[PDB]
Structure formats: C-alpha cells, structure tokens
C-alpha cells in the first residue's frame, strides 16, 4: 500500500465520497477524501498556477491556486508529516479522467526542498526546474498515460491527435531522485511546489483532476485507479 | 517613529515591561512587548543559529533558534504583514548592551525574498548571503556601534581591543536595498532569513540580545534605545 | 570620469567612430569603441533575450543575444576585470536614441553574483530577479528618461504616451545595491546577467541600442551621451 | 565502454601513463591521460576545495582546486562537450587507491545545471546540495568501496575502523537523476559543481587521487581501475 500526501485540484464533484458539490482543492493525507477543501473557480482552456508550500517548523501544508487577474483559492492544514510519510520519498504530478474528461497539461513543474541538520547546522538542497518537457525526458519516471515533449508539454492523460482529452485515463510524472523531506535531527526542513497547468474539455463537465503528491519512492499508480481517485489511491476509504 | 516587526533573542529578561522570567525568544509587532515569547536557553560562547520565516498564504510569522545538539526553541504568530510594514522596507539586525553586556557577533547572514503577482503570475526575488564581512562592506547599512570585518565578523555592538563587550551599546546593519516585501497583486509572497550568531560575556547575566527586523525604509537607531529595547523601539509601551 | 564596461546591443551603425556596417552586439572596456563585435539580426518589435557572463578563473567576458528560432549572435573577450573595475560595482541597464530613434523596452531583468574567498573557503552572493517592474520600484536607481511600470514594464528612454518612442534621449536602470565583483582574496568569482528587451521603432533605420552595464558606484549618465554614446560614454575615444 | 569527462585531483604521479612528475589537477576527454594539467600542491591532512564549471558559450571546463590561504591550482580546456557527451548524463565523484593510498573523503559537493532553450527561451535547472551525508542516502548511487554516513562524511575509498585509508580500493557516488548537460536548441547551457574534500595519507607518496566526472547515465566502475585509473577508465590509453 502506497503512502501519499497529496494537493488536489479537483474539477469534478463526487459528493459520494465527500467532494464539497464544487470544483475544490484539498489537502490530501493518506485518502483521496480531502482533510480540507476550499472552493475553486477553475477554468476551463486557461492556463493557471499552483503553489504547494510546507515546513517542519510550523508543520503546515498550505496551497493557492490562481488564473491572472482572478481571486486565488487557498487552502491550508496541520499536519506533522515526519509522523505521515517516509523519511524518503518521491514528489509527482498525477491526473485522471473518468467518465467524463479534460486535457491535463503541465506547462512547467518547479520544486526546492532543504533540510537543515540539528547535530550540525547544515543544509541538504535539492531543486528543479522544468520550463519545458522533451520527448525523452529521462529525470522523469512517467507512469500510466502520462506523456512529455508533444509542444514542449507534458500530458498527463491521454490526448488524442485532434487535441481532445480520452475518458478512463490515469498518468503520473515523478521526479528521478529520491528526496530526503524529513531527518530527525533537522532543525528545520521545507519544500515549496510550484506548476502551471492547462485544464480544458470541450465537454460542459470536466473531470478528474491533477494533484501535486508526495510518495513511498517506490509508487506507482494503484489498480484501477482512474476518475476520482486521481491515480492516488487504491479506494475511496 | 518607526514601524518594526521583529523576531528577539532577549538574553536578559525585563520583568517590569512583561518580558518572561528567563532568556526567550520573541515575536515584536511594533511593540517591545512581544506578542509570543518562547523560554530560549541562550549557551553562553557557543556559535548558534537562527531561521525565520512568512509567507502570506498562512500570514505566520514563525523562528527557530537552535545550538549543535541541544532542543531547539521555535515561536510562531499569526499576522498579517501587509497590515503591518509598508509595501517597501528594509530587513536588518540589531543588538544593543545596557548595564549587563555581552558581544553581539553575527557570523553569517542570509535572507530570501519572493512575490509572485497575480495580474502576470510572474515573480520578483532578492537574495543575499554573507558568509562573511569585510571591513568596507559597502551593502551594509551600519548604524550606531555596528562594525565589520573584525576577523571578518560584523559585531553589532561595541567590543574592546582585547575583545570584550561594552555596556551601553547599540548597533544595527541593514541590507543596503529596500525590499518589497509584499504587493497587493501578489499570489503568494515570502521570505526567509538565516543568521549565525555568539553572543559570550564575563558577566554572571548578559545582556540584552539580538534581532532580526523589518522596517520603514528610512529606519534609524531610536534616541535612548540601548539595553532593554534593542536599538529597535523608543519606549517599553 | 566613470570607469565602464559594458556589453553593448548596438541597433545603428556609426561607423565614425568604429562600429561595423551593421547591428551588432559588442563589449566596451572603458569606451564606446568595442574590444570585439559580433554581427546582430536585430528584429523590430520582437521581444528577445540577452545573457552575459563572465568568472574570475576563466577571465573572459561572454553574451549571448537571440530570438526565438534564430540563430543567436555570441561576442566573448578576455579580460581580467580585476584590472578594469573598482572592487565595488553597480550593474545597470542603459539606452539611448539620437536622430533616428526605438523604444528601448526592458520586460524582464536579472543578476547573479558569487564570491568565494581564499582565506576562508566562504561564500558571498547577490541575485536579483525583475520578471515585471512596478510603478515605484525601489530598489532601481532611474536616471535620465528612465521610466517603470509602463504596463509592468521599464522603459529606458522616452515614449509618448500614443506608443512613440522619441529621439535624443538617455535612461538607465541600476540596482540599487553595490556589488562585491570581486576581492583579491577569492578563489572564483563570477556574475551572469539576463534581461529580455523590446525595440520597436516606426523609423527605417532603428537606433541606438541597450547595453547591460557595470561602473563604478557612484555612476552617472555623463553630459551629451545620447544616440551613439548609449548613456555610457562622455565622448568617442 | 562509458564515456567520460573529469577534472581530477590526482596525488600519484604515473609519468608511465604520462603524469607530470608532481601531484596535479587535469581535465581527462574520456582518456585518464589528461588533456591539460596544472601543478597542484596537495596537502596532506587539510580540507581542501574543488569547483568546476562550463558553458556552451566559451565551450571551456576550467577547474580551481585551492587550500584556504594558498595559492590555486587552475586548469582549464576549450573543448565542446556537445561532441564528447550524449544528451543526458550522470554526474558524480570517483576516487582510487592502488598500492599506496589515502582517505578520500567528501564533506561536501554541490552541483547546478541550466538549460535555456532556442525555442521558447525558458530554462530548465537542477540544483543539488550535500553538507552532511546520511548512512541511507538514497539520491546517491554508491558503486564499489564508497560508503555515506560516517560522521556525516562521503567515504569514496575504504578506510578501516581505526581512521586508515586502504589500499587497492574503489567508489564512486552519482547523484539519483540523469542531468540535461546539453539539448540541440538551448541559447546557452552551464553547470558548476563544487566540493570538499580531505586527503589524509600515512604514505609518503599518497594516491591515487579523487575525481568529479560526467558520464553516460548506466556507467559503473569499469574493471581493475582501482590505483592510477581513477575508478574512471578501462585502460591507460
Ligand atoms: C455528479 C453527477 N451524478 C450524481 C447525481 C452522477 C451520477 C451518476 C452518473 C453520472 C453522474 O454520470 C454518468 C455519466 C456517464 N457517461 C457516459 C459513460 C458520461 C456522460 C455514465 C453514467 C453516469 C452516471 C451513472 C448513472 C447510472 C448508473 C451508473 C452511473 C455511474 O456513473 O457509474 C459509474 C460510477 O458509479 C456509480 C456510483 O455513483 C456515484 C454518483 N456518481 C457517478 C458519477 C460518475 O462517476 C464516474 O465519472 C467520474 C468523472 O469522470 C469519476 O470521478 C468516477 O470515478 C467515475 O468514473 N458521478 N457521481
Ligand atoms: C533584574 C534585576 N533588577 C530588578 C530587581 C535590577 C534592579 C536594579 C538594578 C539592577 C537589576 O541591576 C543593576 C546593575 C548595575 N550594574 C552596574 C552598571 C551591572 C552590575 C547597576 C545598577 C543596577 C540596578 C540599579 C540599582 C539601583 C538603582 C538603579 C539601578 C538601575 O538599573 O538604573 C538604571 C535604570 O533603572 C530603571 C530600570 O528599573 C527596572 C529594574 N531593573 C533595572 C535593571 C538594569 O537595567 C539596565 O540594564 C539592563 C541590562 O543591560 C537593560 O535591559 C536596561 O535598559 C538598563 O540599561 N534591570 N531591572
Ligand atoms: C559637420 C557639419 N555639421 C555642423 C556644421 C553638421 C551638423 C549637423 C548634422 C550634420 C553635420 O550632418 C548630419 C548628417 C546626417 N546624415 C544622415 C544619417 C548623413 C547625411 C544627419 C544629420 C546631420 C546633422 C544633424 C542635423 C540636424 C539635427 C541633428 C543632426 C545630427 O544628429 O548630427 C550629428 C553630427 O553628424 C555629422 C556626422 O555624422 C555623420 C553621419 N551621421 C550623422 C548621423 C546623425 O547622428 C545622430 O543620430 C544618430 C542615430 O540615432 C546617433 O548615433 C548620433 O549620436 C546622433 O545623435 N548619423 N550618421
Ligand atoms: C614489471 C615487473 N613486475 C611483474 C613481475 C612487477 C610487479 C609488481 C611491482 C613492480 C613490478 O614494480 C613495482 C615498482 C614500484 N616502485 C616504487 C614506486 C618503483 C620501484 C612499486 C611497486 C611495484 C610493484 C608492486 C608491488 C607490490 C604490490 C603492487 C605492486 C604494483 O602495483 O605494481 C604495479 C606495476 O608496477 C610495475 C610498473 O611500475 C611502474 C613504477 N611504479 C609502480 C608503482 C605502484 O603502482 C601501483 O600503485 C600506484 C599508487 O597507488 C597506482 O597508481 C598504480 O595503479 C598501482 O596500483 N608506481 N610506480
Ligand atoms: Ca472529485
Ligand atoms: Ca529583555
Ligand atoms: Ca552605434
Ligand atoms: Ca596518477
Ligand atoms: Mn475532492
Ligand atoms: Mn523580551
Ligand atoms: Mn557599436
Ligand atoms: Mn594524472
């Protein structure tokens, strides 16, 4: 059984499994029924920005996500994630469609995570930068139907040549290296997420989402697991 | 007068204007009285550190100080910022001495500043780091006692030939560029600031700390403001 | 009398005093009249991106000028700027326009700095990042025409407000911290430079050009410096 | 048979393979046989520190390794790494010992790589920092003798229980995530990587040296290239 910590945009509401009857995010800790949501305008064939942020000092995971010129949503919750996840683990971004469906298109996926040690006073650091995707984007481990470098872009769920979205689809992007998120002797550790993304149906419903999560490095996307379960989680539990 | 926000490390406690009965760390809103105070267990000649940090999605201003292998002290205080400081300010360090003493040495200084706007979702930074100073350091604003480049340190207070500290004492170095700290268009703005720290003195209680601040651009030592309010506030009110 | 060097972007030639028969990209040590120049395909009203580097070990003073999808024009000279400049700098952008005119549009402006010392091992560092300039933007020294938040962005010579650039004028952009560009005792030094620019121009012959810039602190635009001069030179020696 | 290009800190002169007759630091094209070489003083028992850097610009690896308070050695090399690498790469350290020997120990290594693209002028980045290593450090794969975890150290050769380095021994540690060294449409492409590192020897003549090299992403230690081969190379050719 994965381990995962996860920020969710949600485009489709599944009040049976708790979904607020809105477009949300939420904060996601070991199932895809959110320990906090907040409600989100997304919309449709624009391009917008999401901001994960967390540190050990405050120990909590706050997100905002934003269209220029409109109000951001935000949403934030405490968790202690040395006592939720793995000291190591890896960070990716999932998305899905079910029976209904959107493109889901990552622009561009940036992450900084430090660690600084109490027996020492020293910092580990790791960053990335992606701006663009190339076709064989070999510091990504691509999963299900995510694909990179059509237009630079990285698809998570499948797109057919015309440019629409497929339903029924489930693809992860995670990063190559393992991350160190947490050590017991840290006086403090932190991350930030960022990515731009493109969500756009020419269905009047989309569906699923994308989520920004955190992982067992040894993930991969449960049996089954496409529509609203975000290729995040076994079950609805 | 001056808007100051500030995190303190109040080596001498001052009873009679509401400081707790023991060294502690200290969260200052435009008062010496600390909105949040936290027991800190100031080591007497050992090199320490100090982290804090914001962010405007949570408006939580938090600190960590911390000695190699002893539990750190943390404090932390909702506030909005841009309630608080002007758009534009500058960041710094102070450190005064009164009737006790003690040498305020800052060994290193790091500080990151990010905000990323909401009409564009495009970001402006400022970073800066000193892991030493040099005997002109033209980016630093020194005011009062403040020197540097003494064995490439910056002693925020005054220190005799044969090193040890003066009484009455008061200095302050702040970052030569104003910094825009926050901005109404901006999705998420944050920073973050390290320093290094040695505080040591011949006295049985020393006095009377260090903070790291934020302030009006046009900020200066107030009249009479050594001991007890830190070169940082003009009364105990 | 200012001691400049400079990577030129040179929209008209002056063949008067040097300039080859063509736009060309060129570095200035101390004038007007490039050490070395490359051939420049300026292209009116697209937005293109330069970058300049240069280190300590290697000695050699590096840019690159393009667009998207042409070839990019590149210009390298070897110098030991330890001989040139003062060991404290400002970095700055300048423009001009004479007789014939452009706008000299800046949408985007950033800078690294690094030192690490001999004595020590210890590390100093600067960045500065503007991807939009506001109206009061604090932290740059405007001089001449020199003008921002004009859409987000910073106009370095003078535009009516119909969009039309003007003739005879000179702006600069500094930041408004010094730089340690570096100390005898480093074991490397190094600076990068970004910025992406604008110059439209209704005229059949554009001029004058942008440069990125590093001076002596106390900088200013020397008397006459418009058109061919750039806002950098006092003559054309 | 792998690829490689290095900077080496080579403490053992083979003048049989031709080594200089002193220790030196050289830049190796996939030969140990060094393409250019300076003198290099090694003092044994003192933390020393190495950075490399390149960029597709001036298409030249330069190297200063340096003692605090002692003059560097530098060395540098025009050459074209497009030509000499593929497109994705791993990056590491190697270090040997042969029949004589020393501790090769890492305190600390950092590495940056940029890509800005032709196309779109965006960048890609990855930044990695270690100031401690850990036992279990995951985004390292350590091949051979190297070991983590010994007072925060990186050991890349065997040492025994009592502090004394071994002879005949081998380790390399590349970091987790293959790294975009180049991409055919890229503006400007460059990277820099710095470490520290502490030679100790009970030898009078130690060895054999520590290296910093890229490779194809699946290369291993090749066979027998314990001693003067440097855990990089095949044969002495
Ligand atoms: C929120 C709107 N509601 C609640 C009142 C709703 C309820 C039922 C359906 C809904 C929608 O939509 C469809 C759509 C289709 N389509 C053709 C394949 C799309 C036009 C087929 C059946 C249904 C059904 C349906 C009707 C009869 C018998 C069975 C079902 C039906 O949807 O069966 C599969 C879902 O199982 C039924 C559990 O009911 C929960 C309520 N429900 C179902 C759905 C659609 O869920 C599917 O798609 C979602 C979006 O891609 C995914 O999050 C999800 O993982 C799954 O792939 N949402 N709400
Ligand atoms: C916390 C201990 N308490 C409260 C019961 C205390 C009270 C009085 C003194 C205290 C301590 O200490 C000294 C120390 C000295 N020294 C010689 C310079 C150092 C041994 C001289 C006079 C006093 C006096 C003293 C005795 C008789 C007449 C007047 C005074 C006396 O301190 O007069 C100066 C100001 O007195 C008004 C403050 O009354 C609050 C009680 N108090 C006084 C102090 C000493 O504060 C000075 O230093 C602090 C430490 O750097 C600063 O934070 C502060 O701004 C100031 O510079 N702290 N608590
Ligand atoms: C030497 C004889 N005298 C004084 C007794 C003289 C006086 C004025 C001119 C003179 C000559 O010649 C020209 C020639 C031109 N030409 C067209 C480019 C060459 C036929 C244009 C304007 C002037 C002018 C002129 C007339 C009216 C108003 C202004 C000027 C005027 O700008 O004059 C500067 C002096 O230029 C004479 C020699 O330059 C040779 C050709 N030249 C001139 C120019 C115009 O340059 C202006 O624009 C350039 C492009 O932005 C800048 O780089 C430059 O810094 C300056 O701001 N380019 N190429
Ligand atoms: C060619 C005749 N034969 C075969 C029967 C032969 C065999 C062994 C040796 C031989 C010769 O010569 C030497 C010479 C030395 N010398 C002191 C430097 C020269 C007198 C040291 C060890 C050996 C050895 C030797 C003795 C015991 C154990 C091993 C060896 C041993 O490793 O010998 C390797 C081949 O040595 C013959 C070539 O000699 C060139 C001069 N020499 C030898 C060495 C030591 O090299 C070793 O260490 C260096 C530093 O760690 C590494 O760079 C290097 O890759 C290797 O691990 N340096 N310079
Ligand atoms: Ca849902
Ligand atoms: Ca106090
Ligand atoms: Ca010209
Ligand atoms: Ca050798
Ligand atoms: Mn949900
Ligand atoms: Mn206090
Ligand atoms: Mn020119
Ligand atoms: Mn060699």
Same mark, same amino acid.
């Given at each position: 059984?994965?381990?995962?910590?996860?920020?969710?945009?949600?485009?489709?509401?599944?009040?049976?499994?708790?979904?607020?009857?809105?477009?949300?995010?939420?904060?996601?800790?070991?199932?895809?029924?959110?320990?906090?949501?907040?409600?989100?305008?997304?919309?449709?064939?624009?391009?917008?920005?999401?901001?994960?942020?967390?540190? @050990? *000092?405050?120990?909590? %995971?706050?997100?905002?996500?934003?269209?220029?010129?409109?109000? $951001? &949503?935000? #949403?934030?919750?405490?968790?202690?994630?040395?006592?939720?996840?793995?000291?190591?683990?890896?960070?990716?971004?999932?998305?899905?469609?079910?029976?209904?469906?959107?493109?889901?298109?990552?622009?561009?996926?940036?992450?900084?995570?430090?660690?600084?040690?109490?027996?020492?006073?020293?910092?580990?650091?790791?960053?990335?930068?992606?701006?663009?995707?190339?076709?064989?984007?070999?510091?990504?481990?691509?999963?299900?139907?995510?694909?990179?470098?059509?237009?630079?872009?990285?698809?998570?769920?499948?797109?057919?040549?015309?440019?629409?979205?497929?339903?029924? @689809? *489930?693809?992860?992007? %995670?990063?190559?290296?393992?991350?160190?998120?947490?050590?017991? $002797? &840290?006086? #403090?550790?932190?991350?930030?997420?960022?990515?731009?993304?493109?969500?756009?149906?020419?269905?009047?419903?989309?569906?699923?989402?994308?989520?920004?999560?955190?992982?067992?490095?040894?993930?991969?996307?449960?049996?089954?697991?496409?529509?609203?379960?975000?290729?995040?989680?076994?079950?609805?539990?």
């Amino acid at each position: 059984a994965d381990t995962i910590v996860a920020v969710e945009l949600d485009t489709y509401p599944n009040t049976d499994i708790g979904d607020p009857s809105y477009p949300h995010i939420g904060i996601d800790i070991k199932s895809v029924r959110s320990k906090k949501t907040a409600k989100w305008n997304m919309q449709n064939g624009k391009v917008g920005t999401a901001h994960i942020i967390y540190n @050990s *000092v405050d120990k909590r %995971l706050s997100a905002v996500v934003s269209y220029p010129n409109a109000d $951001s &949503a935000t #949403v934030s919750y405490d968790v202690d994630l040395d006592n939720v996840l793995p000291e190591w683990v890896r960070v990716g971004l999932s998305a899905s469609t079910g029976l209904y469906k959107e493109t889901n298109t990552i622009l561009s996926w940036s992450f900084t995570s430090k660690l600084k040690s109490n027996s020492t006073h020293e910092t580990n650091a790791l960053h990335f930068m992606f701006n663009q995707f190339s076709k064989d984007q070999k510091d990504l481990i691509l999963q299900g139907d995510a694909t990179t470098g059509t237009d630079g872009n990285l698809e998570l769920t499948r797109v057919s040549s015309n440019g629409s979205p497929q339903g029924s @689809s *489930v693809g992860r992007a %995670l990063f190559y290296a393992p991350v160190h998120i947490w050590e017991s $002797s &840290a006086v #403090v550790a932190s991350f930030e997420a960022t990515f731009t993304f493109l969500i756009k149906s020419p269905d009047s419903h989309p569906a699923d989402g994308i989520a920004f999560f955190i992982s067992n490095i040894d993930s991969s996307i449960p049996s089954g697991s496409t529509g609203r379960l975000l290729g995040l989680f076994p079950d609805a539990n």
